[PDB]
Amino acid sequence: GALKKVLTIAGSDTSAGAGMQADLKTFQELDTYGMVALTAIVTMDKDTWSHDVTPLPMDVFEKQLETALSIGPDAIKTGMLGTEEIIKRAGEVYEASNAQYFVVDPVMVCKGEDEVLNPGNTEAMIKYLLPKATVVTPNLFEAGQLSGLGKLNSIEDMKKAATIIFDKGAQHVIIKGGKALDQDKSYDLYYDGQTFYQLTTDMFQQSYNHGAGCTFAAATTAYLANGKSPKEAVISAKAFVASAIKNGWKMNDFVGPVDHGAYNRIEHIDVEVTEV
Amino acid sequence: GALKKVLTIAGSDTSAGAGMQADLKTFQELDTYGMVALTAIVTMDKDTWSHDVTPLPMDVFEKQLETALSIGPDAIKTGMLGTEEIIKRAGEVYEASNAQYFVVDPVMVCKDEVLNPGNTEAMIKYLLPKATVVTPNLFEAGQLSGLGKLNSIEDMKKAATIIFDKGAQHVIIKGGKALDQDKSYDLYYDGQTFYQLTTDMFQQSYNHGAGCTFAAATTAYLANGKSPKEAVISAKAFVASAIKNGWKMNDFVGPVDHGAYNRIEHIDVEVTEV
Ligand SMILES: Nc1ncnc2c1ncn2[C@@H]1O[C@H](COP(=O)(O)OP(=O)(O)O)[C@@H](O)[C@H]1O
Ligand SMILES: Nc1ncnc2c1ncn2[C@@H]1O[C@H](COP(=O)(O)OP(=O)(O)O)[C@@H](O)[C@H]1O
């Protein structure tokens, strides 16, 4: 049958490792028809790599959503969304569409590493996106914010956060451990409301991992669209991103992206799956 | 070795078949590191499919170029560029970069007339003399050459000569549906020899993004080390498969399948000196 239509709602990462660029790249690697409704353009200073976020006007955001809704996505992913207004609209486009899958990557920006910048966006994601999400994909910080637990440091903490987030309406929860968990291996925790699954790969180099989160969530969405269950989709996504990470490369002294095409071009990576 | 970094200077096609979307998708298919400096956003009315083109401000355009230049592209493609100002800056950024390859897709909208011939003039002045490859369709080639309507391979040879002499190192004029409908003929010229490139003419219903995809593939193939002639032949094969495997999105548009070459099938290109 036809390619599945997969929409991301996200900003442009000019460096092209994260943002909508990671999304579209990943959708393409996974044999789906990628689409984007652009929210903002992120650029980087040539000397410091300091970010500058330029919002797109709401009129143009809405016109893009109108076109995408008309086309009719089979699955929708949200990336980093910067305002309450866009968060609310993203949930509404999903609800208006005939998409069967909604993957929410609840991206938050930090003022420390234990302090959120812009707590209002967290409340808006809880209010508008969690109750709609097929899969929500917080990192360890984000999971602590969504759950209200604060700092999480263990699989047991992640289980508690997943329970809470599920109870807030997300159908499936994957709490990424990854670098933030800082163990010998890379652990994530998947929950479906009944069983907790720990997903494990090797922990690869950490220097060039830009776009890992976006890519994981994008892969999850494409795998869902192509007919994997949420559990299978997150397992497959972890393999996909792990290869991308292993094969990350140095862009400059400030960043290096994952290699989105590594899973297909270079190597598959094994994922261990255990009940916890 | 490292992925080649390939930048497109292009707008967003919200429908995702053409524009920067086709470019990034094609770059990815061809095992390069795709990047975009966005010039504009094109949206379509849900009921009539009427297009609205929203230019992006020059300040955000410049911020993107600074980032992309810092990264350091190995190859740059230009897509549909809306203003003489942008056309000029695109050539400048190529020269400022260490990129070895510049692929200019001289996209025009036919309104033997364009909306603003000043854009054609700016392409001639600022882009053609920097281009490794320029990739006009039959209409665009008439405009760039000053010949108007082209009807034949012979006309295409004249237009290719004129465009080459305006300073493009290599010229491929796409005939496609405009020229004939039993086969899809293109004319490649390197200043020395004229080559006709041929595939079968495939379905014509769902061909959205074909031109962008062709120029994007040319760019990636040059970045990955194919000569200009081999790059354009490979690009024609790549897009031929994408066209053959095109599909209906809605009543208004049917995109090419950018991944068809690698996932579905290759298509051989017949090459003959003419
Ligand atoms: N260096 C690494 N090696 C292996 N897996 C990793 C690594 N970094 C992250 N991951 C995995 O990549 C995915 C994305 O992780 P995420 O936590 O979103 O990235 P970040 O560290 O930016 O927050 C998760 O599946 C996570 O386990
Ligand atoms: N229906 C078709 N069958 C086979 N090849 C085609 C078809 N339509 C276009 N082509 C080829 O696709 C490429 C892009 O052509 P074209 O669509 O003329 O560019 P443009 O969109 O800029 O008009 C060329 O190599 C052309 O020969």
3-state secondary structure chain B: CCCCEEEEEEEEECCCCCHHHHHHHHHHHCCCEEEEEEEEEEEECCCCCCEEEEECCHHHHHHHHHHHHHHCCCEEEECCCCCHHHHHHHHHHHHHCCCCEEEECCCCCECCCECCHHHHHHHHHHHHHHCCEECCEHHHHHHHHCCCCCCCHHHHHHHHHHHHHCCCCCEEEECHHHCCCCEEEEEEECCCCEEEEEEECCCCCCCECHHHHHHHHHHHHHHCCCCHHHHHHHHHHHHHHHHHCCCCCCCCCCECCCCHHHHCCCCCCEEEEC
What does the buried/exposed string (b/e) look like for A94-108 if buried means 16 or more CB atoms within 10 Å of the residue's CB? beebebebbbbbbbb
Residues near A108 by Cβ (< 8 Å), separated by ≥ 6? A116, A117, A118, A121, A122, A141, A142, A145
CATH 3.40.1190.20, applies to A1-276: yes
Pairing relation of β-strands B133-134 and B75-78?
A: unpaired
- Mark yes or no for CB contact B43/A33 under 8 Å: no
- CA-to-CA distance for A175 and A157, rounded, in angstroms? 10
Architecture of domain B1-274 in CATH? Answer: 3-Layer(aba) Sandwich (3.40)
- CA-to-CA distance for B206 and B210, rounded, in angstroms? 9
Tell whether ligand 2 has an atom less than 6 A from the beta carbon of residue B202.
yes
- CA-to-CA distance for A62 and A249, rounded, in angstroms? 36
Task: Please check whether residue B100 is in contact with residue B71, taking contact to mean a CB–CB distance below 8 angstroms.
Answer: no
Ligand 1 atom nearest A188 alpha carbon: 27
Closest-CA residue, ligand 1 atom 20, reads A213
- CA-to-CA distance for A211 and A225, rounded, in angstroms? 21
- Mark yes or no for CB contact A44/B68 under 8 Å: no
Structure tokens belonging to residue A112: 């420390």
Tokens 């600022």, residue located: B126
Task: Please check whether residue A79 is in contact with residue A213, taking contact to mean a CB–CB distance below 8 angstroms.
Answer: no
Pairing relation of β-strands B101-104 and B133-134?
A: parallel
Q: What are phi and psi of B231, to 5 degrees?
A: -65, -45
Q: What are phi and psi of A214, to 5 degrees?
A: -60, -45
- CA-to-CA distance for A169 and A190, rounded, in angstroms? 15
Burial class of residue B274 in the structure, from the number of CB atoms within 10 Å of its CB (0-12 exposed, 13-18 middle, 19+ buried): middle
Residues of A in contact with B38 (CB under 8 A): 12, 38, 41
Task: Give the containing element (helix H, strand E) for A96.
Answer: helix A84-96
Burial class of residue B52 in the structure, from the number of CB atoms within 10 Å of its CB (0-12 exposed, 13-18 middle, 19+ buried): middle
Residues near B16 by Cβ (< 8 Å), separated by ≥ 6? A33, A34, A35, A36, B22, B255
What does the buried/exposed string (b/e) look like for A132-145 if buried means 16 or more CB atoms within 10 Å of the residue's CB? bbbbbbbbbbbbbb
CA distance A269 to chain B (A): 19
Kindly identify the ligand whose nearest atom is closest to the C-alpha of A256.
Answer: 1
The ranges assigned to domains in chain B are 1-274
How many A from CA of A188 to the centre of ligand 1? 9
Tell whether ligand 2 has an atom less than 6 A from the beta carbon of residue B205.
no
A31: nearest CA partner in chain B? B259
- Mark yes or no for CB contact B259/A36 under 8 Å: no
Closest among A243, A238, A165 to A204, alpha carbons compared: A243
Residues of A in contact with B63 (CB under 8 A): 14, 41, 43, 52, 54
Paired with B40 in beta bridges are B55
Instruction: Give CA torsion, residues A219, A225, A230, A231, to 10 deg.
Output: -60
Reported resolution, Å: 1.4
Paired with A257 in beta bridges are A210
User: What distance, in Å, lies between the first and last C-alpha atoms of chain B?
Assistant: 38
What is the SS3 assignment for A125? helix
What is the SS3 assignment for A110? strand
Q: How was this structure determined?
A: X-ray
How many Å is the Cα radius of gyration of chain B?
A: 17
Q: What is the 3-state secondary structure (H, E, C) of B181-204?
A: CCEEEEEEECCCCEEEEEEECCCC
Alpha-carbon separation of residue B18 from A174, A276, B64, B258 (angstroms): 34, 46, 20, 10
Structure tokens belonging to residue B245: 């495997």
Other CB atoms within 10 Å distance of the CB of residue B118: 12
**A16, A36, A54 ranked by CB distance to B35: nearest:** A16
- CA-to-CA distance for B141 and B104, rounded, in angstroms? 12
Other CB atoms within 10 Å distance of the CB of residue A171: 17
Closest among A51, A4, A2 to A228, alpha carbons compared: A4
Length of chain B: 274
- CA-to-CA distance for A105 and A217, rounded, in angstroms? 6
- CA-to-CA distance for B44 and A67, rounded, in angstroms? 6
Structure tokens belonging to residue B226: 């194919």
Beta strands per DSSP E along chain A: 5-13, 33-44, 51-55, 75-78, 101-104, 109-110, 116-117, 135-136, 172-176, 185-191, 196-202, 272-275
In this structure, the residues whose C-beta lies within 6 A of any atom of ligand 1 are A 139, 176-180, 186, 188, 201, 203-204, 206, 209, 212-213, 216, 238, 241-242, 245
Q: What are phi and psi of B244, to 5 degrees?
A: -55, -35
Structure tokens belonging to residue A24: 């579209």
Discontinuities after residues in chain B (C–N over 2.5 A): 111
State the DSSP string of A191-243.
Answer: E-SS-EEEEEEE---SSS-BTHHHHHHHHHHHHHHTT--HHHHHHHHHHHHHH
Residues near B68 by Cβ (< 8 Å), separated by ≥ 6? A14, B7, B35, B37, B93
Pairing relation of β-strands A109-110 and A116-117?
A: antiparallel
Alpha-carbon separation of residue B245 from B85, B194, B240 (angstroms): 37, 29, 9
Residues of B in contact with A52 (CB under 8 A): 63
Residues near B135 by Cβ (< 8 Å), separated by ≥ 6? B103, B104, B105, B106, B172, B174, B211, B214, B215, B218
- CA-to-CA distance for B186 and B53, rounded, in angstroms? 30
Paired with B5 in beta bridges are B33
Diameter over CA atoms, chain A: 50
What is the SS3 assignment for A151? coil
Side by side, the strands of the sheet bearing A33-44 are A51-55, A33-44, A5-13, A75-78, A101-104, A135-136, A172-176, A185-191, A196-202, A272-275
Alpha-carbon separation of residue A33 from A27, B16, B109, B179, B181 (angstroms): 7, 8, 26, 30, 28
Structure tokens belonging to residue B31: 């095992």
Task: Please check whether residue A97 is in contact with residue A225, taking contact to mean a CB–CB distance below 8 angstroms.
Answer: no
Task: Please check whether residue B196 is in contact with residue B271, taking contact to mean a CB–CB distance below 8 angstroms.
Answer: yes
- Mark yes or no for CB contact B25/A28 under 8 Å: yes
Residues near B246 by Cβ (< 8 Å), separated by ≥ 6? B203, B205, B206, B207, B208, B254, B255, B256, B257
Q: What are phi and psi of A155, to 5 degrees?
A: -55, -45
Which residue from A26, A204, A245 has its CB within 8 A of the most atoms of ligand 1, so it is best to mutate? A245
Q: Percentages helix, strand, coil for chain A, rounded to the nearest 5?
A: 40, 25, 35
Positive or negative: CA dihedral A83, A84, A85, A90:
positive
The chain A residues in contact with chain B (CB within 8 A) are 2-3, 12, 14-16, 21, 24-25, 28-29, 31, 33-38, 41, 43-46, 52, 54, 56-57, 60, 63-64, 66-71, 249, 251-252, 257, 259-261, 265
Structure tokens belonging to residue B266: 């290759």
CA distance A122 to chain B (A): 28
Task: Please check whether residue B207 is in contact with residue B91, taking contact to mean a CB–CB distance below 8 angstroms.
Answer: no
How many Å is the Cα radius of gyration of chain A?
A: 17
Structure tokens belonging to residue A202: 């090797």
Residues of B in contact with A258 (CB under 8 A): none
Q: What are phi and psi of B44, to 5 degrees?
A: -135, 130
Other CB atoms within 10 Å distance of the CB of residue A267: 12
